[PDB]
Design a protein around this ligand. Structure first.
Ligand SMILES: Nc1nc2c(ncn2[C@@H]2O[C@H](COP(=O)(O)O)[C@@H](O)[C@H]2O)c(=O)[nH]1
Ligand SMILES: Nc1nc2c(ncn2[C@@H]2O[C@H](COP(=O)(O)O)[C@@H](O)[C@H]2O)c(=O)[nH]1
Ligand SMILES: [Ca+2]
Ligand SMILES: [Ca+2]
Ligand SMILES: [Zn+2]
Ligand SMILES: [Zn+2]
Ligand SMILES: [Zn+2]
Ligand SMILES: [Zn+2]
Lengths: 524, 524
């Protein structure tokens, strides 16, 4: 039997440096985790011990910290090249800076193949990008070969900025003929590496004949066999076994997100490329693993430009930005309005004739707003200033919520009003009126929302059975601040852009801001 | 006696081409007026006939039409040079593109002196601008000399974009010592040429000892002796005689605006430079005066780049821009909101610690909105598109109105509601609620306005005795659409930027717009 060790990462999201346990800024170095210098140590150890190793990434290196803001993917090519990745699939966030921001910094500079079988280009773009990403690559591994076939979320156009010259095909439709072709070329060991989420990964394992292993991402899915090593709760066993339509057992793996874990799967193959066995587990990259000194020194050299950028003017405010708890946990606050307006601006994506934009609505817990910004520093706003407002290292995510769910969220917003608690919601594209004289759970007396399926945006009453797209912090999507109804009732969740980065981009675009308090939230 | 002919223009405001009677686009060429080619003909005729002629401009050549949008003052230097102006005073609108947009295109390229005695620079700007404008110039005229001393509105910082490195001094304070100095230099014939308005011009004539003649501007003041030649109603005789504090009779002149008239004043001086007599009248530049063919051919060559620019993309909309009468004469319309938001953005000026901005409020007659813009031309918005929305060649002016006046305007807005009449007001920085079941004059049931004297903009009830700054069309400032209360009760009026140009700049800054209908106007 021929044994292959698959090492894999996904959704690293710009965590070049080691992190806290929750993947935010490292504060207590002795308890920090992940980062590329530590990953290097572990990958190097494994490659000393195991003859046949592939190191794969299932996409979404782009977006997540100031590294991406400043280096715009140059850091991804540089550090993934230093770690000698063997292949990467395109994720949705690889399109955040458009096609041009993918071609240059990543596709031209990577020393490994970049894969996606389900993305096609037309017009001049097709000639410009031809061969810079591939449907698959056949890689030599010892005396054998392994085909790796890529895929990317069909939903990328709603979740990034790929432009109108790329088409994202159904994954299974695109993958089957490539896997078929590899069979005709005597490639009997096939890994599907891609970025569509655990649910699609299981359908691929089930339906794509000839796929031996699925290495996925996008859904930040933690899988584990045994007692978990940290705070992440497993969604299932590692690997997750799918029984394929042709009767095979196909392992499906993912490795959470943020470079906290290294995925590690050992596969035994027979001489015909059938999987005989698969086992493994992600490896927690905790402080017991040293950071590689050479990689760490290069990280610290690249950090200089980050420190320089963090104090540069992004733009100006002519108004006090009231991020005080005394405002933002009690009433509409102009910092809340600014951040929600930045969230909606970030989620402007290419529109059908069926909507002016796919999403119009925003909610933001006032407890997530951690500082005001004073306008009397000649109006300057810096990244450092925004990092005081938004210090948790979160994202602004896209969810789909029934109106009934959102009305329950707005009741939760004021259920214990008057105690300076974090759950009070700031808004965009929503007008709410509370009557605090009513019983908790019955305080919302008007709730109007900005239409999407309309040529002129206007407000209509919220409908209980309608499903709304809403931009909100990951903290709330995950049921933080007691918003269990959001976690338990949401119909869709996709992780979005770094919180600070969303606001910094909007302020840079606007150049001079003057957000008002304007009656998005009223009390009767 | 030594006779001087003073020819003068003021507030030409980018009317390079001949105009309609109302100074808008020329439609019936046989009835058109003004323009630089016609002015050239008349000035050339006068210079053949009169030995001692000065041609003066009292400022505000900048701003008014697409000429200024595209050529940014190069057209002013070029055509004023072709007409051989002898001197120009700086107006407020010469600062619309900042100090840099004055130095380059106008101060460096003009072949005549540019004057202002009451503007001082500090820091590096002082060295950069030194001598590029002057307090005064002594000009040879035949065998004599005439001193011309300039001045500019002290209010320029509220009415343009001069920046924080220029100080505008009290006119009379600055002028007196310059006029004194010219006396010590044996210059006994002194013209004050400047841009502060008729009321300040009369104070200058009264109080500045040694000024023989005041040639003014800014207030678009029409003065005439006799039966007026066109639709402009004279504010007084031409010249307007002020009795000075030293007992002299000092003529004060102005020549309306928009190049419609050439001011023409004949002064007789004795050998000591005392005015013995003054007489004249502005000359209506009507179609009986031919356009100079050489100037007209140069105008038509410069027009090519205007035509090219008029169809270029300024920016995009992802929403239908509803400028329909069925919306904008009956309820809040998103085109109205866009134009009002552009008006407020245009009037962001350098703020004290006493206000976030000096003005927060906007009203716009819905009858002044003349077209929608469809978003389905790939979202493109062109100048040509904006010219269909705003076809009247007006300005967005700054006024000061008591709250009582503004409440009366909002009653007038709905006095005969339901007939698709033009007076219905679109708004910015104002939230109004009507109850149309009430009697005309008593339909406004809530009227809240955005604060200025506040660090966080928020809405407060309108106060009847408070004076508010409001941006509004010149048509309304002048009492159009039956808004006689605005004309009759306003405390201040200053002419602002060209309507199309205000909106085009805002759309270019924003790049992608999506104005909503959001409850600025409601009905109970
Ligand atoms: N986004 C986000 N907000 C958080 C997080 N932890 C706490 N919060 C917010 O901070 C509040 C607690 O703040 P105080 O300790 O200041 O009261 C919570 O109610 C919540 O609104 C986090 O990890 N992410
Ligand atoms: N700004 C401005 N609006 C005007 C002018 N003349 C008319 N209007 C507007 O057009 C309306 C008349 O339009 P109708 O003819 O389309 O009904 C007036 O009520 C007024 O609102 C003008 O010279 N300038
Ligand atoms: Ca196989
Ligand atoms: Ca004199
Ligand atoms: Zn991701
Ligand atoms: Zn993803
Ligand atoms: Zn003017
Ligand atoms: Zn002026």
């Amino acid at each position: 039997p021929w044994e292959l060790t698959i090492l894999h990462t996904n959704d690293v999201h710009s965590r070049l440096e080691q992190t806290s346990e929750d993947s935010s800024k490292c504060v207590d170095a002795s308890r920090c985790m992940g980062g590329v210098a530590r990953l290097f140590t572990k990958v190097q150890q494994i490659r000393r011990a195991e003859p046949n190793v592939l190191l794969l990434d299932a996409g979404d290196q782009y977006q997540g910290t100031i590294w991406f803001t400043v280096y715009k993917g140059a850091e991804v090519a540089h550090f993934m090249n230093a770690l000698r990745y063997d292949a990467m699939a395109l994720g949705n966030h690889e399109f955040d800076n458009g096609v041009e921001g993918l071609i240059e910094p990543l596709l031209k500079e990577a020393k490994f193949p970049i894969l996606s079988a389900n993305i096609s280009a037309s017009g001049p773009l097709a000639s410009q990008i031809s061969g810079l990403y591939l449907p698959y690559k056949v890689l030599p591994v010892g005396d054998e070969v392994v085909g790796i076939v890529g895929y990317t979320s069909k939903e990328t156009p709603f979740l990034s900025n790929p432009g109108t010259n790329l088409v994202f095909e159904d994954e299974i439709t695109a993958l089957q003929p490539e896997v078929d072709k590899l069979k005709t070329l005597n490639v009997n060991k096939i890994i599907a590496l891609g970025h569509s989420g655990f649910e699609m990964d299981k359908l691929i394992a089930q339906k794509v004949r000839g796929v031996d292993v699925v290495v996925g991402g996008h859904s930040n899915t933690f899988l584990y066999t045994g007692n978990p090593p940290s705070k992440e709760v497993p969604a299932g066993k590692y690997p997750f076994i799918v029984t394929s339509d042709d009767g095979r057992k196909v392992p499906v793996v993912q490795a959470y997100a943020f470079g906290k874990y290294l995925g590690y799967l050992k596969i035994e193959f027979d001489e015909r490329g059938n999987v005989i066995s698969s086992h493994g587990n992600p490896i927690l990259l905790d402080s017991s693993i040293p950071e590689d000194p050479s990689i760490k020194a290069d990280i610290n050299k690249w950090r200089i430009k980050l420190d320089d950028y963090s104090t540069q003017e992004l733009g100006k405010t002519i108004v006090y930005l009231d991020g005080s708890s005394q405002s933002c946990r009690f009433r509409e606050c102009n910092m809340g309005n600014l951040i929600c307006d930045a969230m909606i601006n970030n989620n402007l994506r290419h529109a059908d004739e069926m909507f002016w934009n796919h999403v119009s609505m925003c909610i933001l817990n006032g407890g997530g707003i951690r500082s005001p910004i004073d306008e009397r520093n000649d109006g300057t706003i810096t990244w450092e200033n925004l990092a005081a407002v938004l210090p948790f290292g979160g994202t602004f995510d896209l969810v789909q919520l029934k109106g009934s769910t959102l009305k329950k969220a707005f009741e939760h917003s004021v259920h214990r009003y008057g105690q300076s608690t974090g759950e009070f919601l700031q808004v965009g594209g929503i007008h709410v009126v509370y009557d605090l004289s009513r019983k908790p759970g019955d305080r919302v007396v008007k709730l109007d929302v900005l239409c999407t399926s309309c040529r002129v945006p206007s407000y209509d009453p919220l409908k209980m059975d309608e499903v709304y797209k809403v931009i909100l912090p990951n903290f709330l999507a995950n049921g933080g601040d007691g918003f269990q109804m959001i976690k338990d009732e949401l119909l869709r969740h996709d992780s979005g852009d770094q919180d600070i980065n969303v606001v910094s981009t909007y302020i840079s675009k606007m150049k001079v801001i003057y957000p008002a308090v304007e009656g998005r939230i009223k009390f009767s």
